[PDB]
Amino acid sequence: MNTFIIFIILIPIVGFALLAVNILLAVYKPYNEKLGAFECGLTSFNQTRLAFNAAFILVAILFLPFDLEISTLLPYVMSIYLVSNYGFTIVLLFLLILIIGFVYEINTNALKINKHNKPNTDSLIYKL
Amino acid sequence: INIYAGGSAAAAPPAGFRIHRPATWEESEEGALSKATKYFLLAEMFRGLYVVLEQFFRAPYTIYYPFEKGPVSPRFRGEHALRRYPSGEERCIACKLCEAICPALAITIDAEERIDGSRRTTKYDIDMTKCIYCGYCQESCPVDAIVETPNVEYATETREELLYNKEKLLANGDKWELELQYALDADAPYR
Amino acid sequence: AIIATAFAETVKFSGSKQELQKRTLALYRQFLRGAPTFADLYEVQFSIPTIRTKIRQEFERHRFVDDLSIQNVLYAKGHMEYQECINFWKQQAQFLKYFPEEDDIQGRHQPSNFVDKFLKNRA
Amino acid sequence: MIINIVEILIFLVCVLFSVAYLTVAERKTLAYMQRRLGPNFVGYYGLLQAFADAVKLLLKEIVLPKESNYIILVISPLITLITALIGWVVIPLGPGITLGELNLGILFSLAIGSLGVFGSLLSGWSSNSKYSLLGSIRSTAQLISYELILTSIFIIIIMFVSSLNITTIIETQRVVWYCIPLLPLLLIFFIASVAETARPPFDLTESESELVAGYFTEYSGSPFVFFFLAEYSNIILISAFNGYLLLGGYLSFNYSYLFNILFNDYSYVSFLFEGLINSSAYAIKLVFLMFSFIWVRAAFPRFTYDNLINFCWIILLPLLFGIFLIIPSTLYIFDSFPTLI
Amino acid sequence: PSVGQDLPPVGGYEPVQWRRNLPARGFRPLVYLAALCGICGYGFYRALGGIQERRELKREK
Amino acid sequence: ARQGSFWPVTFGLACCAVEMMHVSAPRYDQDRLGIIFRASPRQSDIMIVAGTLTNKMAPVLRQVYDQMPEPRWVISMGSCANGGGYYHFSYSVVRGCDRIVPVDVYVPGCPPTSEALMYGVFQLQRKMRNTKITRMWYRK
Amino acid sequence: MLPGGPVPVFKKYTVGSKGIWEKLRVLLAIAPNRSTGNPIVPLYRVPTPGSRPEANVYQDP
Amino acid sequence: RIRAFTINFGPQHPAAHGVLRLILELSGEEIIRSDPHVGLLHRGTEKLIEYKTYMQALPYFDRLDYVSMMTNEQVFSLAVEKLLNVEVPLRGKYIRTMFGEITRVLNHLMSVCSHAMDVGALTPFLWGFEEREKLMEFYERVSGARLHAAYVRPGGVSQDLPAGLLDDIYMWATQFGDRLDEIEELLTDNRIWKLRTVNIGTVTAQDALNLGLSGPMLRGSGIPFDIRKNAPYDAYDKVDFDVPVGMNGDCYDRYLIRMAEFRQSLRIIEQCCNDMPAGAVKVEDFKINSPPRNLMKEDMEALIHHFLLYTKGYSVPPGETYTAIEAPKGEMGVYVVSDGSERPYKCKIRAPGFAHLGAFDHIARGHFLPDAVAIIGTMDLVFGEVDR
Ligand SMILES: CCCCCCCCCCCCCCCCCC(=O)OC[C@H](COP(=O)(O)OCCN)OC(=O)CCCCCCCCCCCCCCCCC
């Protein structure tokens, strides 16, 4: 029984203290419209999802590889002395190869949100 | 000197109405490194932070209300009151000009001949929940009977307490006569 | 520009009863098709048949009108109400103005002859 | 294990009451910046405002709407609060004065911070609402996007000290605090801290959603108290990360001369004064960083989601992928790759 | 007539400030960049010097 | 606790909201008394009806009121909300939020000054300060 | 100057600093011209509106 | 097919400063169609005015745009004066001008510092509202009400200025410039403000005219139009002020226009405090205006006229007029019809916010939702005037 172990178990199996205090002390007599949700608002049986832009999911899909890159750099910073001037060059090559993909990401503009209703920029020409 | 076709000397554009032209990245009187320092070091943002911090060391404007009140003037329009003469007789004479000018129709009056032959009211009611606190009644009265005190601290728990009647208004005048006298001595020459 | 809403119809006054006939029948069709939506959107305590009965009643109310322009105005206001109901702009409170019959019986004494109304001062 | 319980209870009490008074500090500092004063009426000088708020909330109904989920709505605050509080186990207030003296402390911090995203994820699932499920998505995108920058700064610091022991990272800064060689990283870490805490100028979905009927945290009662504790504890913990990475943690001037003057041998007064000085340093740094959070709330306007994602992924990460190359090169040029411990 | 009216003074009032008064402040930006570079260079001199001493202490250990 | 944390819902409909905002301003600081205006009713304890109540808006008012967790109170701010006011005889105005929701304190004015709304807040504070919670159970 | 600014502090009817604190404020200010907008209490809204002497001599213009 | 998703921005919510039901349709983040639903603050003002004398009807206008009261009653007074064919005295004109610009300062302090708050800047709101309090005190000292003064009436002004008000207004004016400067330090050159404002809500000059926009909304697109310079009404032909006009039609240009208008209003207030004439503040025709009390209580004609003006009212000649002012929101107008009676036959208020919120659909299409907040904030929408 170390203080670390005591704390990390005690926080979860005690965190419901004020939860129970609130459940026992506080009123609970619901209405229909107190179980409701808004000022106005409704939706028929149309669908279960909304159409979303690609960047919304691409940021999450690209979080995985860049996070794995930055987490794969942890062995290097914990081995930096032992891999002296060899692993340094190796991790630099690693970072350059992974910067090429970041360059691709920037040049494609993959996290940009595009706008449909463009403003009209075409001249007004009158057939005489 | 000039004849105009569908136009005017005023409708002609001013001398420099055509803006000069946008400025490109060339024709820049500011080096790239300097504006990049302003870009990376957040110059204007730190300046705004400092302008906010300068206020941290300035006097707060806050007045502690139940113990210190805010500025009131003789013209202020608050709770209503029916006034008397120094005789003790009531000033109102049932002329019904306040009932007539009231935009909200908050005043309700009924009158008849008193036992001593005098024109005096038997009913005088104000629905505060109709009133807009405009002062037209205080302007219309030719005897300074209906007035508006400087009071605002008369909130209630029930709306039936805001249907003021003649006795309430007369008691309110008997309560607030000194404040009303200060206000009148300050305000009457201007009205 | 300022574009119209979902179920908008440009105001176009028919110059014929035979065209307004088709327009009115189409609007009736649309109300009937949308009654399930009116029951789902507004938390309605009664049948979809009841909603369609009410629609038919309100369409029968103006059945024997013959002035064309009055019929045009009635069609326009009917389409306004359809757009207000199908697009969830109304609330239940305003939708249930059409349905006073479904609310419980308003008391015991509802006069229908003279002496009742007299005793209640409604004659 | 008696004194272990005592140490834990002292630490818990001090941390939680610091949170409760950070709420009041936020309000009063923002006020005096705004040429006002408040709160000053619900205790003497306003020192019971947070406890009044807590006691009110712990007597309110725990209404859960019709088309919502009971369990998720109720435990998401609690999971968020647990994860916010167990991150304090590794925070040292002295040379080894810690609850958890883990040699993998940085990774514990960086891994328990990885779990704070689940609160914002699961909040959206506590209703049959299709737009709150997108506000959830936007918030989670922000959080996972600035996690990378915090982790990158962690690794750039660990390039200088090859250890994941927080006390060792602090004791390496007896020479120089890492805010001096890496002053821009201090700005970047503070910015990413404000963004991870979802605090203004990065308060998009809270601001977004109070407009709409949904997409924010519409909790009542005890969930609400737990969320406030989580927020104002994560603020102090991310400022703690700032501290022990860049501002030296508990370090100050060297007080050997003063102690040799005042004392002649190790006593318990000596140890108490050492501890008070060290934790005083740590606390004044935390106070400055919390004041900075409040200042930034007072000063600037808000971002949009596009501007924010663009900020992150097109301005900040390029600099850091460059710094990943420049720091080991600077260590290679001068033969200064750091040893273990 | 006009007896007790609120009227202005004879020489009017001293003029007020209604134009923008946001003065330019601060050193030129390259001074701030030079200070940054010097701060960080000195910090690197101080830190890398400490890494070498730690390495020698490790040798001792 | 109910006094020192006094969180109304943001229900400003008309020109009485200007005085509410001035009660949040530096001269009169509502935050000094614990007051924080909360957007959603689920986090709120008070509803200050500050503005005229139109017949197109009353269902929304009642929905907002019913979404509030108990304990809940209502302040009627201004003549328009107290008894319809200036627009008492209109075709679109409700003659008081009394008709739609129950009211605990009526603040009169048009507009009621910031001081008057603060006096109303103090009157509701006195009401809740004289409220019997456990004592009434001990009677029941 | 121009006809519309800037104007010094001592020509602005606001309560400022005195002594070492003014010497510090003019050192730490973005614009020492700027004022702390607290009205001078001896001069602002004094005599009060309900105690003005001009009421006794006021006549209808 | 691009299926759209309908969100109600909220009958009750923060960004609307009042009560608005903005039914937006989105395809992702982008707005494609908007449908501002109004009438939630329709109180039947324009029918009530038909049952009121011209004096009883004047407080309807204080309560339309309730941050700019005196300008609304100014335009109604101008309309009824044009029908009555009476001339306001010079002192009344100067008072109306000075207080119209105080009212402009109040409106812009609300509008800019609520736009800021809705975009996220909380601190300018609380700075500017103290200056609002300082000016509300002048309102209260002249009229007796902090907000709804009922001061500017047909024929001039209700009451003369109290003693010692010009000195205090000058004392406020000596320091208001630094307040403006401190707000600008936070907002003007800021990156986040420019991001939230630059090239958002763009409207062209041609479309600005076609949609009926005026004020800053029309001046930000490049058209130099201001009714105070093109059709001066009270005293703006006797005071020097410049008009700010912007290119690019964005919200940043409107913000800069409103700050320039702050400074020009301060200029006008200085000139009016220096050049305030002597004399009467209302017309000296007791068939239109109430006489003084000391004559009503000593003169028979004065009392007769008091009685009639406060019971029946003054009868306006038959006719009709549309007159307008450069209200701080834009071109505010009143179309009055007179039937020779003491009560109007018809009073339509052309509120500047009605047209702007109607143009919301054209202006906000293609934008993201955070930008709709800025657009609502730069339109400066109070909903008493929208709904009347
Ligand atoms: C250091 C920390 C120390 C902490 C110290 C704390 C000490 C507490 C000592 C408490 C002893 C006294 C308790 C008296 C409280 C009662 C208060 C009261 O008188 O009534 C107010 C409230 C009313 O609830 P209600 O009966 O529904 O009335 C509706 C209209 N007001 O009454 C209430 O609030 C009652 C709350 C009851 C909460 C239970 C909710 C139900 C949960 C279980 C499910 C059972 C549901 C059954 C509902 C009925 C269904 C038909």
Ligand SMILES: CCCCCCCCCCCCO[C@H]1O[C@H](CO)[C@@H](O[C@H]2O[C@@H](CO)[C@H](O)[C@H](O)[C@@H]2O)[C@H](O)[C@H]1O
């Ligand atoms: C954590 C301890 C356990 C008990 C829980 C305590 C809960 C109390 C939390 C309060 C923390 C401060 O949080 C609060 O700050 C200020 C208070 O003025 C609010 O701010 C409100 O006030 C005004 C100030 O006049 C602001 O301009 C802002 O527009 C808003 O209306 C914030 O919207 C809210 O977030």
Ligand code: SF4
């Ligand atoms: S001041 Fe009040 S009571 Fe008198 S007329 Fe006006 S609204 Fe009616």
Ligand code: SF4
């Ligand atoms: S209060 Fe005055 S105006 Fe009204 S009826 Fe009496 S005397 Fe006439």
Ligand code: SF4
């Ligand atoms: S009571 Fe008066 S101030 Fe309040 S909303 Fe009604 S008219 Fe406006």
